[PDB]
C-alpha cells in the first residue's frame, strides 16, 4: 500500500471524527466557560509534533472516551483505535517504531470525576480531542517526525 493512500485515509478519518464531534456537540449546547476542576488527566491543547506523541495522546483520549457511557462515544473510541492502527501503519512506512502504548494505567481520577460530572467531562473531552485532532491534521500536512 502506497504511503500517500495511507495518509489520505488518515486525513479522511480525521475529518470524519471532527464531523461526528461537531454533530454530537450541536446536540450538546454547553457554554465553553464552564471550568471544571480535576480534569488535568485529559490531554491539553499543546503543540504535538511527533507520531509517538500522537499515538500516546490518542490512546489517552480513547481510554477517557471508553469510560463514558455514551454509545456514540464508544464508536468514536472504535474510530480512535482504527486511527492508532493507521498511525502505526504510517510509522512502518517511515521506518519508525512507535512504542506500544498499552501500558497506560487507568487514570484513578476517572472514577472520581465521572461520578461528579459525566456530561461536562464528555463535553470537555470532545472539545479537547477535536482541537488536538485538528492539530494532528495540520501536523500531518507538514510531515511530522517519529
Amino acid at each position: 500500500v502506497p504511503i500517500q493512500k495511507v495518509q489520505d485515509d488518515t486525513k479522511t478519518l480525521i475529518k470524519t471524527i471532527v464531523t461526528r464531534i461537531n454533530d454530537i456537540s450541536h446536540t450538546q449546547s454547553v457554554s465553553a466557560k464552564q471550568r471544571v476542576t480535576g480534569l488535568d488527566f485529559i490531554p491539553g491543547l499543546h503543540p504535538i509534533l511527533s507520531l509517538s506523541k500522537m499515538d500516546q495522546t490518542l490512546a489517552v483520549y480513547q481510554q477517557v472516551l471508553t469510560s463514558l457511557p455514551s454509545q456514540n462515544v464508544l464508536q468514536i473510541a472504535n474510530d480512535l483505535e482504527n486511527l492508532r492502527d493507521l498511525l502505526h501503519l504510517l510509522a512502518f512506512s517511515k521506518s519508525c517504531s512507535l512504542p506500544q502504548t498499552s501500558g497506560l494505567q487507568k487514570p484513578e481520577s476517572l472514577d472520581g470525576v465521572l461520578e461528579a460530572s459525566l456530561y461536562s467531562t464528555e463535553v470537555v473531552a470532545l472539545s479537547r480531542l477535536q482541537g488536538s485532532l485538528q492539530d494532528i491534521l495540520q501536523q500531518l500536512d507538514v510531515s511530522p517526525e517519529c
Binding site: 485515509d9 464531523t19 464508536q75 472504535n78 482504527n82
Partner: protein
C-alpha cells in the same frame, strides 16, 4: 456390504467407493464386479479400480448437481456381478453452495445491512442454515477464506424470500469475511467465503434543498442544491431534468466538479414548467447512487419582454360628411413566439400634432375604439409583460389630405375554388412610397363577417385561402399605405 454407505460433497469434486459382493456362502473376485448407477447406466471400466481381489473400487471426477427424481434426493449406485445385482446400494448428495450475499451501508454510517436468498437451500428439508463471519481489522484480502474463528449472525427472512442481516455499530475500514453455513442432519457445509468493506458499499442520502430557476435575460435553467453529509465530500452528482407533464421527458446532466453547488443548463422552451431531480454517488464511483432528490418545479415567469407589438387594423364607422369618425382598432393576441411567455396588458400609444402623444392601457382586450378628429394622427399598439412593453411595434398614421390620394389603378378577383380566390391589381405609375397593401374583404350585406390582411407593396398577385361561398356576395377592398396615411382604396363587389 458397502463402505461407505452415504457420501456428502459439493459440485466440482471427485468420488471413490468400495464394494464387497456376498452371494450365498461365497465371495467372488473383484475382477467380475460391474458397477451401475440408478440401474440405468453402466459405469465405464476406466473409472474402476482393483485395490484387492475381493474389493472393487470406482473413482469419479467432476461430479455435477443432481436433478431431483420424485421424492428421492439421491441416486442409488449398484455394484453388481455380471447382471446379478444386490438389493443394497449407496447414497450421494451434492447440493449447490455458491450463494451470493448483498450488503449495503446506510447513508448515516451507523448500520450494515446484508441480504441473501435461501432459494438454493429450499430443496433440502431438515437442513439448518447459520451465517458465519469473521471481521478483519485490516482490509479485505484478495482471496477471502473461511477463518477458524467465526461468529454466528442472526438474520430475518423477509416476505421477499430474502434473509436480511443488520450489523451495528460498524467499522468502515475493517474487512468483513463472510460465508454461509448450512447444517443438515448429515453434517455441515459452507458457501464460498466473501469479504466486504463497509466503505465500498455506501449508499448516500438523497441531495437536499434542490432549487430550480430559469436565469432571467438568459433562459438558462440554473439549479441549486444542498449536499448531503458525506466523508471527503467526494461525491459524483447526477441531475435529471424534464418537462412537467403526464410524462416527464427526463434529460440528464452530470456535474463532475464535486465542489459545485449550483449549475445552469440550456432549455429549449423558456415558458414551461419543468421537473428536476438530483442523485449523487461517491466521486470514485464506489458504493451506490443516492436516492433521487425531491422534484423541483420551475415557475413560469417572463424572462424577456414581448418581441413585437400586435398587428392591428382599423374599422371606420361614421358618416363621410362627418369630420369626427370613431375608429375601432382590431388586433390579435401575440403568439407564443411573439408573446414569448405571456402578454399581460395592451397599451395603445397615440400621436397627434396638437395633443402630442399619449397611451391607453386597453388591458387584455384586443380592441380599442376611439374618435378621429385631427387631420394628422399616428397610432401604435404596444404589448406589455411584467418586464415592460414590446420592442418592434406597428405604426399607423391617419391623414385627411392623404385619404383623397388614389394609388390603386385596377382590381380584379378570381375565385380559384371555395377555398381560394385570386386577386389581380395594377398600380398607378406614380412614385408612391407604398409601405404595403391591405386586402380587406367581407361578405356583402354582412357587417360582422369582416376580414382583412396586410400584404407587402411589392406583391402584385395574391391568393386568399378561406371558405368562400359562391352564393354569397363578397366585397373586396385593397388599401394603399404610405408615410402620411392610407390612400383611397379600390373596392369591387363579386368576382
Amino acid at each position: 456390504v458397502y463402505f461407505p454407505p452415504k457420501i456428502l460433497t459439493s459440485v466440482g469434486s471427485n468420488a471413490s467407493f468400495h464394494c464387497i459382493y456376498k452371494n450365498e456362502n461365497q465371495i467372488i473376485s473383484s475382477k467380475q464386479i460391474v458397477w451401475w448407477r440408478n440401474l440405468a447406466e453402466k459405469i465405464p471400466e476406466i473409472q474402476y479400480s482393483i485395490v484387492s481381489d475381493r474389493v472393487s473400487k470406482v473413482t469419479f471426477s467432476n461430479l455435477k448437481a443432481t436433478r431431483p427424481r420424485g421424492k428421492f434426493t439421491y441416486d442409488a449406485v449398484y455394484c453388481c456381478n455380471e447382471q446379478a445385482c444386490h438389493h443394497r446400494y449407496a447414497e450421494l448428495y451434492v447440493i449447490d453452495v455458491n450463494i451470493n450475499i448483498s450488503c449495503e451501508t446506510d447513508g448515516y454510517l451507523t448500520k450494515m445491512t446484508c441480504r441473501w436468498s435461501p432459494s438454493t437451500i429450499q430443496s433440502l428439508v431438515g437442513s439448518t442454515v447459520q451465517l458465519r463471519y469473521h471481521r478483519r481489522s485490516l482490509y479485505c484480502p484478495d482471496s477471502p477464506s473461511i477463518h477458524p474463528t467465526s461468529e454466528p449472525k442472526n438474520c430475518v427472512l423477509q416476505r421477499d424470500g430474502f434473509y436480511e442481516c443488520v450489523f451495528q455499530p460498524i467499522f468502515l475500514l475493517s474487512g468483513y469475511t463472510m460465508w454461509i453455513r448450512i447444517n443438515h442432519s448429515l453434517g455441515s457445509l459452507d458457501s464460498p467465503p466473501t469479504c466486504v468493506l463497509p466503505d465500498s458499499v455506501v449508499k448516500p442520502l438523497p441531495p437536499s434543498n434542490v432549487k430550480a430557476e430559469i436565469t432571467v435575460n438568459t433562459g438558462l435553467l440554473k439549479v441549486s442544491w444542498e449536499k448531503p453529509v458525506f466523508p471527503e465530500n467526494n461525491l459524483q452528482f447526477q441531475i435529471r431534468y424534464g418537462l412537467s407533464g403526464k410524462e416527464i421527458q427526463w434529460k440528464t446532466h452530470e456535474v463532475f466538479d464535486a465542489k459545485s453547488k449550483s449549475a445552469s443548463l440550456l432549455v429549449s422552451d423558456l415558458c414551461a414548467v419543468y421537473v428536476v431531480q438530483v442523485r449523487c454517488r461517491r466521486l470514485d464511483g464506489l458504493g451506490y447512487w443516492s436516492n433521487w432528490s425531491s422534484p423541483a418545479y420551475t415557475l413560469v415567469m417572463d424572462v424577456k419582454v414581448p418581441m413585437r407589438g400586435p398587428e392591428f387594423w382599423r374599422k371606420m364607422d361614421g358618416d363621410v360628411t362627418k369630420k369626427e369618425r370613431n375608429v375601432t382598432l382590431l388586433w390579435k393576441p401575440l403568439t407564443k413566439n411573439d408573446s414569448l411567455c405571456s402578454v399581460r396588458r395592451y397599451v395603445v400609444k397615440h400621436r397627434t400634432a396638437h395633443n402630442g402623444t399619449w397611451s391607453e392601457d386597453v388591458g387584455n382586450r384586443t380592441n380599442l375604439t376611439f374618435l378621429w378628429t385631427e387631420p394628422a394622427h399616428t397610432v401604435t399598439v404596444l404589448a406589455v409583460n411584467s418586464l415592460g412593453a414590446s420592442l418592434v411595434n406597428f405604426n399607423l398614421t391617419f391623414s385627411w389630405p392623404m385619404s383623397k390620394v388614389s394609388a390603386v389603378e385596377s382590381l380584379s378577383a378570381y375565385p380559384l375554388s371555395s377555398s381560394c380566390v385570386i386577386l389581380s391589381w395594377t398600380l398607378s405609375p406614380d412614385d408612391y412610397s407604398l409601405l404595403y397593401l391591405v386586402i380587406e374583404w367581407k361578405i356583402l350585406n354582412e357587417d360582422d363577417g369582416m376580414k382583412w390582411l396586410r400584404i407587402p407593396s411589392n406583391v402584385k398577385k395574391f391568393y386568399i385561402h378561406d371558405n368562400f361561398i359562391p352564393i354569397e356576395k363578397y366585397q373586396f377592398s385593397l388599401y394603399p399605405v404610405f408615410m402620411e396615411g392610407v390612400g383611397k382604396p379600390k373596392i369591387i363587389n363579386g368576382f
